[PDB]
């Protein structure tokens, strides 16, 4: 069904299940070196 979920495996093996959602949030993330705060689906970040 093209859920397009970004599942990340922690240092222990814990998933996150980030849903991309609609088509407007275009994906740009294939780094495989992500760190906290890194954006995945393009656009202006929410600072709060």
PDB file of N, CA and C in Angstrom:
ATOM      1  N   UNK A   1       0.809  -1.210   0.000  1.00  0.00           N
ATOM      2  CA  UNK A   1       0.000   0.000   0.000  1.00  0.00           C
ATOM      3  C   UNK A   1       0.846   1.265   0.000  1.00  0.00           C
ATOM      4  N   UNK A   2       2.173   1.127  -0.006  1.00  0.00           N
ATOM      5  CA  UNK A   2       3.107   2.252  -0.007  1.00  0.00           C
ATOM      6  C   UNK A   2       2.921   3.124   1.237  1.00  0.00           C
ATOM      7  N   UNK A   3       3.072   2.486   2.399  1.00  0.00           N
ATOM      8  CA  UNK A   3       3.037   3.227   3.654  1.00  0.00           C
ATOM      9  C   UNK A   3       4.234   4.158   3.783  1.00  0.00           C
ATOM     10  N   UNK A   4       5.377   3.768   3.213  1.00  0.00           N
ATOM     11  CA  UNK A   4       6.619   4.534   3.270  1.00  0.00           C
ATOM     12  C   UNK A   4       6.926   4.927   4.708  1.00  0.00           C
ATOM     13  N   UNK A   5       7.291   3.953   5.533  1.00  0.00           N
ATOM     14  CA  UNK A   5       7.663   4.215   6.915  1.00  0.00           C
ATOM     15  C   UNK A   5       9.176   4.107   7.051  1.00  0.00           C
ATOM     16  N   UNK A   6       9.777   5.078   7.732  1.00  0.00           N
ATOM     17  CA  UNK A   6      11.216   5.090   7.965  1.00  0.00           C
ATOM     18  C   UNK A   6      11.456   4.414   9.310  1.00  0.00           C
ATOM     19  N   UNK A   7      11.838   3.144   9.269  1.00  0.00           N
ATOM     20  CA  UNK A   7      12.125   2.374  10.469  1.00  0.00           C
ATOM     21  C   UNK A   7      13.632   2.363  10.683  1.00  0.00           C
ATOM     22  N   UNK A   8      14.065   2.809  11.857  1.00  0.00           N
ATOM     23  CA  UNK A   8      15.478   2.896  12.200  1.00  0.00           C
ATOM     24  C   UNK A   8      15.764   1.921  13.333  1.00  0.00           C
ATOM     25  N   UNK A   9      16.902   1.241  13.245  1.00  0.00           N
ATOM     26  CA  UNK A   9      17.293   0.249  14.241  1.00  0.00           C
ATOM     27  C   UNK A   9      18.281   0.898  15.200  1.00  0.00           C
ATOM     28  N   UNK A  10      17.945   0.895  16.487  1.00  0.00           N
ATOM     29  CA  UNK A  10      18.749   1.580  17.487  1.00  0.00           C
ATOM     30  C   UNK A  10      20.076   0.852  17.702  1.00  0.00           C
ATOM     31  N   UNK A  11      20.858   1.355  18.662  1.00  0.00           N
ATOM     32  CA  UNK A  11      22.098   0.681  19.029  1.00  0.00           C
ATOM     33  C   UNK A  11      21.829  -0.696  19.622  1.00  0.00           C
ATOM     34  N   UNK A  12      20.648  -0.894  20.207  1.00  0.00           N
ATOM     35  CA  UNK A  12      20.248  -2.196  20.724  1.00  0.00           C
ATOM     36  C   UNK A  12      19.353  -2.971  19.769  1.00  0.00           C
ATOM     37  N   UNK A  13      18.673  -2.290  18.850  1.00  0.00           N
ATOM     38  CA  UNK A  13      17.773  -2.964  17.937  1.00  0.00           C
ATOM     39  C   UNK A  13      16.324  -2.557  18.106  1.00  0.00           C
ATOM     40  N   UNK A  14      16.092  -1.304  18.487  1.00  0.00           N
ATOM     41  CA  UNK A  14      14.744  -0.793  18.697  1.00  0.00           C
ATOM     42  C   UNK A  14      14.290  -0.001  17.477  1.00  0.00           C
ATOM     43  N   UNK A  15      13.106  -0.331  16.968  1.00  0.00           N
ATOM     44  CA  UNK A  15      12.550   0.358  15.814  1.00  0.00           C
ATOM     45  C   UNK A  15      11.890   1.671  16.233  1.00  0.00           C
ATOM     46  N   UNK A  16      11.652   2.533  15.244  1.00  0.00           N
ATOM     47  CA  UNK A  16      11.032   3.830  15.479  1.00  0.00           C
ATOM     48  C   UNK A  16       9.718   4.029  14.744  1.00  0.00           C
ATOM     49  N   UNK A  17       9.598   3.523  13.515  1.00  0.00           N
ATOM     50  CA  UNK A  17       8.366   3.595  12.729  1.00  0.00           C
ATOM     51  C   UNK A  17       7.954   5.050  12.479  1.00  0.00           C
ATOM     52  N   UNK A  18       8.809   5.749  11.729  1.00  0.00           N
ATOM     53  CA  UNK A  18       8.498   7.101  11.281  1.00  0.00           C
ATOM     54  C   UNK A  18       7.664   7.016  10.010  1.00  0.00           C
ATOM     55  N   UNK A  19       6.411   7.473  10.012  1.00  0.00           N
ATOM     56  CA  UNK A  19       5.617   7.464   8.776  1.00  0.00           C
ATOM     57  C   UNK A  19       5.889   8.713   7.949  1.00  0.00           C
ATOM     58  N   UNK A  20       6.225   8.514   6.674  1.00  0.00           N
ATOM     59  CA  UNK A  20       6.400   9.648   5.772  1.00  0.00           C
ATOM     60  C   UNK A  20       5.064  10.337   5.524  1.00  0.00           C
ATOM     61  N   UNK A  21       4.024   9.557   5.247  1.00  0.00           N
ATOM     62  CA  UNK A  21       2.692  10.094   5.105  1.00  0.00           C
ATOM     63  C   UNK A  21       2.336  10.441   3.675  1.00  0.00           C
ATOM     64  N   UNK A  22       1.862  11.661   3.460  1.00  0.00           N
ATOM     65  CA  UNK A  22       1.398  12.073   2.132  1.00  0.00           C
ATOM     66  C   UNK A  22       2.564  12.208   1.157  1.00  0.00           C
ATOM     67  N   UNK A  23       2.232  12.629  -0.066  1.00  0.00           N
ATOM     68  CA  UNK A  23       3.240  12.734  -1.107  1.00  0.00           C
ATOM     69  C   UNK A  23       4.063  14.003  -1.060  1.00  0.00           C
ATOM     70  N   UNK A  24       3.524  15.068  -0.469  1.00  0.00           N
ATOM     71  CA  UNK A  24       4.220  16.349  -0.376  1.00  0.00           C
ATOM     72  C   UNK A  24       5.542  16.235   0.382  1.00  0.00           C
ATOM     73  N   UNK A  25       5.613  15.522   1.526  1.00  0.00           N
ATOM     74  CA  UNK A  25       6.923  15.345   2.169  1.00  0.00           C
ATOM     75  C   UNK A  25       7.821  14.392   1.395  1.00  0.00           C
ATOM     76  N   UNK A  26       8.481  14.916   0.365  1.00  0.00           N
ATOM     77  CA  UNK A  26       9.379  14.127  -0.466  1.00  0.00           C
ATOM     78  C   UNK A  26      10.561  13.612   0.345  1.00  0.00           C
ATOM     79  N   UNK A  27      10.961  12.370   0.073  1.00  0.00           N
ATOM     80  CA  UNK A  27      12.037  11.752   0.836  1.00  0.00           C
ATOM     81  C   UNK A  27      13.387  12.113   0.229  1.00  0.00           C
ATOM     82  N   UNK A  28      14.367  12.366   1.095  1.00  0.00           N
ATOM     83  CA  UNK A  28      15.727  12.668   0.664  1.00  0.00           C
ATOM     84  C   UNK A  28      16.720  11.870   1.498  1.00  0.00           C
ATOM     85  N   UNK A  29      16.215  10.988   2.357  1.00  0.00           N
ATOM     86  CA  UNK A  29      17.019  10.342   3.388  1.00  0.00           C
ATOM     87  C   UNK A  29      17.385   8.924   2.970  1.00  0.00           C
ATOM     88  N   UNK A  30      18.669   8.709   2.671  1.00  0.00           N
ATOM     89  CA  UNK A  30      19.228   7.370   2.527  1.00  0.00           C
ATOM     90  C   UNK A  30      20.643   7.313   3.096  1.00  0.00           C
ATOM     91  N   UNK A  31      20.946   8.183   4.062  1.00  0.00           N
ATOM     92  CA  UNK A  31      22.317   8.315   4.531  1.00  0.00           C
ATOM     93  C   UNK A  31      22.835   7.087   5.257  1.00  0.00           C
ATOM     94  N   UNK A  32      21.964   6.408   6.004  1.00  0.00           N
ATOM     95  CA  UNK A  32      22.337   5.294   6.876  1.00  0.00           C
ATOM     96  C   UNK A  32      23.382   5.699   7.914  1.00  0.00           C
ATOM     97  N   UNK A  33      23.439   6.989   8.255  1.00  0.00           N
ATOM     98  CA  UNK A  33      24.294   7.496   9.323  1.00  0.00           C
ATOM     99  C   UNK A  33      23.565   8.558  10.136  1.00  0.00           C
ATOM    100  N   UNK A  34      22.244   8.419  10.270  1.00  0.00           N
ATOM    101  CA  UNK A  34      21.430   9.482  10.840  1.00  0.00           C
ATOM    102  C   UNK A  34      21.775   9.704  12.309  1.00  0.00           C
ATOM    103  N   UNK A  35      21.582  10.941  12.761  1.00  0.00           N
ATOM    104  CA  UNK A  35      21.770  11.315  14.153  1.00  0.00           C
ATOM    105  C   UNK A  35      20.595  12.183  14.577  1.00  0.00           C
ATOM    106  N   UNK A  36      20.436  12.339  15.892  1.00  0.00           N
ATOM    107  CA  UNK A  36      19.270  13.020  16.442  1.00  0.00           C
ATOM    108  C   UNK A  36      19.130  14.424  15.869  1.00  0.00           C
ATOM    109  N   UNK A  37      17.914  14.759  15.443  1.00  0.00           N
ATOM    110  CA  UNK A  37      17.610  16.041  14.860  1.00  0.00           C
ATOM    111  C   UNK A  37      17.671  16.081  13.347  1.00  0.00           C
ATOM    112  N   UNK A  38      18.319  15.104  12.718  1.00  0.00           N
ATOM    113  CA  UNK A  38      18.453  15.106  11.267  1.00  0.00           C
ATOM    114  C   UNK A  38      17.091  14.995  10.596  1.00  0.00           C
ATOM    115  N   UNK A  39      16.858  15.847   9.603  1.00  0.00           N
ATOM    116  CA  UNK A  39      15.622  15.800   8.844  1.00  0.00           C
ATOM    117  C   UNK A  39      15.652  14.640   7.854  1.00  0.00           C
ATOM    118  N   UNK A  40      14.463  14.220   7.425  1.00  0.00           N
ATOM    119  CA  UNK A  40      14.367  13.102   6.497  1.00  0.00           C
ATOM    120  C   UNK A  40      13.538  13.441   5.265  1.00  0.00           C
ATOM    121  N   UNK A  41      12.463  14.212   5.435  1.00  0.00           N
ATOM    122  CA  UNK A  41      11.467  14.375   4.382  1.00  0.00           C
ATOM    123  C   UNK A  41      11.347  15.817   3.899  1.00  0.00           C
ATOM    124  N   UNK A  42      12.425  16.598   4.017  1.00  0.00           N
ATOM    125  CA  UNK A  42      12.553  17.897   3.356  1.00  0.00           C
ATOM    126  C   UNK A  42      11.606  18.958   3.915  1.00  0.00           C
ATOM    127  N   UNK A  43      12.035  20.219   3.886  1.00  0.00           N
ATOM    128  CA  UNK A  43      11.216  21.318   4.341  1.00  0.00           C
ATOM    129  C   UNK A  43      11.812  22.059   5.521  1.00  0.00           C
ATOM    130  N   UNK A  44      11.145  23.130   5.953  1.00  0.00           N
ATOM    131  CA  UNK A  44      11.618  23.874   7.127  1.00  0.00           C
ATOM    132  C   UNK A  44      11.298  23.128   8.415  1.00  0.00           C
ATOM    133  N   UNK A  45      12.305  22.989   9.272  1.00  0.00           N
ATOM    134  CA  UNK A  45      12.143  22.263  10.522  1.00  0.00           C
ATOM    135  C   UNK A  45      11.374  23.091  11.543  1.00  0.00           C
ATOM    136  N   UNK A  46      10.682  22.396  12.437  1.00  0.00           N
ATOM    137  CA  UNK A  46       9.995  23.050  13.544  1.00  0.00           C
ATOM    138  C   UNK A  46      10.971  23.241  14.699  1.00  0.00           C
ATOM    139  N   UNK A  47      11.285  24.478  15.093  1.00  0.00           N
ATOM    140  CA  UNK A  47      12.297  24.684  16.137  1.00  0.00           C
ATOM    141  C   UNK A  47      11.828  24.371  17.549  1.00  0.00           C
ATOM    142  N   UNK A  48      10.520  24.283  17.795  1.00  0.00           N
ATOM    143  CA  UNK A  48      10.041  24.046  19.152  1.00  0.00           C
ATOM    144  C   UNK A  48      10.211  22.592  19.570  1.00  0.00           C
TER     145      UNK A  48
END
